[PDB]
Design an enzyme around this catalytic site. Structure first.
Site, PDB file in Angstrom:
ATOM      1  N   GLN A  67      12.396   4.326   5.109  1.00  0.00           N
ATOM      2  CA  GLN A  67      12.680   3.405   6.200  1.00  0.00           C
ATOM      3  C   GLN A  67      12.061   2.047   5.902  1.00  0.00           C
ATOM      4  O   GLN A  67      12.668   1.009   6.117  1.00  0.00           O
ATOM      5  CB  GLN A  67      12.057   3.978   7.484  1.00  0.00           C
ATOM      6  CG  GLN A  67      12.791   3.717   8.796  1.00  0.00           C
ATOM      7  CD  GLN A  67      12.141   4.463   9.970  1.00  0.00           C
ATOM      8  OE1 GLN A  67      11.102   5.109   9.805  1.00  0.00           O
ATOM      9  NE2 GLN A  67      12.749   4.372  11.153  1.00  0.00           N
ATOM     10  N   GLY A  68      10.841   2.044   5.405  1.00  0.00           N
ATOM     11  CA  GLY A  68      10.103   0.811   5.369  1.00  0.00           C
ATOM     12  C   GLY A  68       9.166   0.650   4.200  1.00  0.00           C
ATOM     13  O   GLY A  68       8.850   1.591   3.455  1.00  0.00           O
TER      14      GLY A  68
ATOM     15  N   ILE B  14       0.812  -1.208   0.000  1.00  0.00           N
ATOM     16  CA  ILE B  14       0.000   0.000   0.000  1.00  0.00           C
ATOM     17  C   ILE B  14       0.849   1.262   0.000  1.00  0.00           C
ATOM     18  O   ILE B  14       0.325   2.357  -0.201  1.00  0.00           O
ATOM     19  CB  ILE B  14      -1.002   0.070   1.194  1.00  0.00           C
ATOM     20  CG1 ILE B  14      -0.260   0.091   2.535  1.00  0.00           C
ATOM     21  CG2 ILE B  14      -2.024  -1.056   1.123  1.00  0.00           C
ATOM     22  CD1 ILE B  14      -1.173   0.224   3.745  1.00  0.00           C
ATOM     23  N   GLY B  15       2.157   1.129   0.213  1.00  0.00           N
ATOM     24  CA  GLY B  15       3.043   2.278   0.184  1.00  0.00           C
ATOM     25  C   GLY B  15       4.481   1.949   0.528  1.00  0.00           C
ATOM     26  O   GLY B  15       4.803   0.848   0.966  1.00  0.00           O
TER      27      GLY B  15
ATOM     28  N   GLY C  75       8.296   4.119   1.880  1.00  0.00           N
ATOM     29  CA  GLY C  75       9.016   5.302   2.283  1.00  0.00           C
ATOM     30  C   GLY C  75      10.489   4.951   2.285  1.00  0.00           C
ATOM     31  O   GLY C  75      10.886   3.977   1.638  1.00  0.00           O
TER      32      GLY C  75
ATOM     33  N   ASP D 129       9.603  17.086  10.950  1.00  0.00           N
ATOM     34  CA  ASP D 129       9.570  16.514   9.606  1.00  0.00           C
ATOM     35  C   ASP D 129       8.179  16.141   9.132  1.00  0.00           C
ATOM     36  O   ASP D 129       8.001  15.173   8.400  1.00  0.00           O
ATOM     37  CB  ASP D 129      10.515  15.290   9.489  1.00  0.00           C
ATOM     38  CG  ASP D 129      10.916  14.977   8.014  1.00  0.00           C
ATOM     39  OD1 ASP D 129      10.933  15.880   7.170  1.00  0.00           O
ATOM     40  OD2 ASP D 129      11.152  13.798   7.715  1.00  0.00           O
TER      41      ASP D 129
END
Ligand code: ANP
Lengths: 12, 349
Positions: free
Chosen positions: B37-38, B32-33, B35, B151
Site C-alpha cells: 500500500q505504502g 524505513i520500510g 509494503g 491478515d
C-alpha cells in the site's frame, strides 16, 4: 526471572 | 488559483522513485520500510520535537475494496488508543482540492523494526511469551471493537528494543487461516491461527506454511498438521471441497515432532516445562478446524502467556466508534473518494 524493563531486543 | 496559497504549507523530497510532499514540520525523511500500500519514512517532527513514521498511501480509492480498507484504517487508528495498536499522530494530504487529491500521509509513532528480524533471533521464553501476550492484547482489543483482522503477519507488527510491540493495521498468504484461504465463514479466532504461525516461526526459523500459491499453501498445511475431518470438509463450497479432497491423505506430525526440544532451551527444569507449555499452546492455535481452535481469551489464560496478564491491558474497554463510519453500506468509487477526502481534511491536526 526478569522485570519487563529488562526484556531487550538487540535490533539492527 | 484560489486555494494555491495552501501549497506553501508543504515541501517535497525524493525518496527513491517517489516524491514525498509533507508538512514543513516533518524534517529529514529517510526510508524505513515498504509494503504493498505504502512507502514509509522516518522523520523528525519539529513541532512535537520527536521522531515519527510517515506512510504515504497513493490513490486509496482505486476501487471499492481498497477504499473500504483505507477508510476503515483512518477511522480506527483515530478512535483506538491502546498500547499494542499503533497510534495516529496526524493525517494530511498535500493536494488542495477533491479533484487533485490522490495521496494520504499517515503520521504515526516511530517504532524500531518489524517482527521479521526478531523471528530469526534466538529468543528466550520470556521475550517470546511477552511478545505473544502483547499481540494477543492488541487482537483482543480489536475484537472487542467488532474488528477481526484476518491478515496478521510479521511485516505488520512492529517492536521497540524494550520488547514492546504494536500492530500496524486493521486487516482485510503464509499466515492466513484455513478458513480465509478456503473462503469459509470465520469468527474471531481466525486471528489465533496467525499468532500460531508467527509463534511457530519464532521457534523453527522457517515460515511454517510457505505456499507458492493458494493450493500449495493448503498442501503445506495438511502435510504438517494432517488432513482435516469430514466435519470440516462439509463446510467447504462444492468446488473447493472437490480440490481439498483430491490429494494425498496426510496424517501430519505430532507437535513433539514439529517442535522438538532441540529448538528450545534445555538448561533447566524450568525451560523443560516451558518447552512443553509452548508446544501445548501451539497445538491449540495451529488447529485447522476453527471450531476446535483456542480462543483469544483462552490463549491469554494459557500458562505460557498468562505470566504477563494484566486486565488493564488485556481487558481495556473498547473504543467508541463513530456512527455509520464503520458501516457495511456500499458506495460508488467517486463517493468513496469524497468520503476519504473529507475524513483526511477532518482528521488533520
Ligand atoms: N509506525 C512505524 N514505525 C516503524 N516502522 C514502521 C512503521 N510503520 C511501518 N513501518 C515499517 O514499514 C514496513 C511497511 O509498512 P506497511 O506499509 O504498513 O506495510 P505492511 O503492514 O507490510 N502492508 C513495516 O513492515 C515496517 O518495517
Amino acid at each position: 526471572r526478569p522485570s519487563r524493563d529488562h526484556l531487550y531486543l538487540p535490533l539492527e | 488559483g484560489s486555494r494555491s496559497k495552501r501549497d506553501n504549507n508543504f515541501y517535497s523530497v525524493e525518496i527513491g522513485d517517489s516524491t514525498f510532499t509533507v508538512l514543513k514540520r516533518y524534517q529529514n525523511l529517510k526510508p524505513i520500510g515498504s509494503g504493498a500500500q505504502g512507502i514509509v519514512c522516518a522523520a523528525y517532527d519539529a513541532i512535537l520535537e520527536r521522531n515519527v513514521a510517515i506512510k504515504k498511501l497513493s490513490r486509496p480509492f482505486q476501487n471499492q475494496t481498497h477504499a473500504k480498507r483505507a477508510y476503515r484504517e483512518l477511522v480506527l487508528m483515530k478512535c483506538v488508543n491502546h498500547k499494542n495498536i499503533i497510534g495516529l499522530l496526524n493525517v494530511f494530504t498535500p493536494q488542495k482540492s477533491l479533484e487533485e487529491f490522490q495521496d494520504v500521509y499517515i503520521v504515526m509513532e516511530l517504532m524500531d523494526a518489524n517482527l521479521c528480524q526478531v523471528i530469526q533471533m534466538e529468543l528466550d521464553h520470556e521475550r517470546m511469551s511477552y511478545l505473544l501476550y502483547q499481540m494477543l492484547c492488541g487482537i483482543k482489543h480489536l475484537h472487542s471493537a467488532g474488528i477481526i483482522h484476518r491478515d496478521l503477519k510479521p511485516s505488520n507488527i512492529v517492536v521497540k528494543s524494550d520488547c514492546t510491540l504494536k500492530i500496524l493495521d486493521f486487516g482485510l498468504r503464509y499466515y492466513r487461516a484455513p478458513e480465509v484461504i478456503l473462503g469459509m465463514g470465520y469468527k474471531e479466532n481466525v486471528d489465533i491461527w496467525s499468532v500460531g504461525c508467527i509463534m511457530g516461526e519464532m521457534i523453527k526459523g522457517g515460515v511454517l506454511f510457505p505456499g507458492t500459491d493458494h493450493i500449495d499453501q493448503w498442501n503445506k498445511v495438511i502435510e504438517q498438521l494432517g488432513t482435516p475431518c469430514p466435519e470440516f470438509m462439509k463446510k467447504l463450497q462444492p468446488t473447493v471441497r472437490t480440490y481439498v479432497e483430491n490429494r494425498p491423505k496426510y496424517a501430519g506430525y505430532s507437535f513433539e515432532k514439529l517442535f522438538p526440544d532441540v529448538l528450545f532451551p534445555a538448561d533447566s527444569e524450568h525451560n523443560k516445562l516451558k518447552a512443553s507449555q509452548a508446544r501445548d499452546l501451539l497445538s491449540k492455535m495451529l488447529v485447522i478446524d476453527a471450531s476446535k481452535r483456542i480462543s483469544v481469551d483462552e490463549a491469554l489464560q494459557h500458562p505460557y502467556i498468562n505470566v504477563w496478564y494484566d486486565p488493564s491491558e488485556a481487558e481495556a474497554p473498547p473504543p467508541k466508534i463513530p456512527d455509520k463510519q464503520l458501516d457495511e453500506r456500499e458506495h460508488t468509487i467517486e463517493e468513496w473518494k469524497e468520503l476519504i477526502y473529507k475524513e483526511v481534511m477532518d482528521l488533520e491536526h
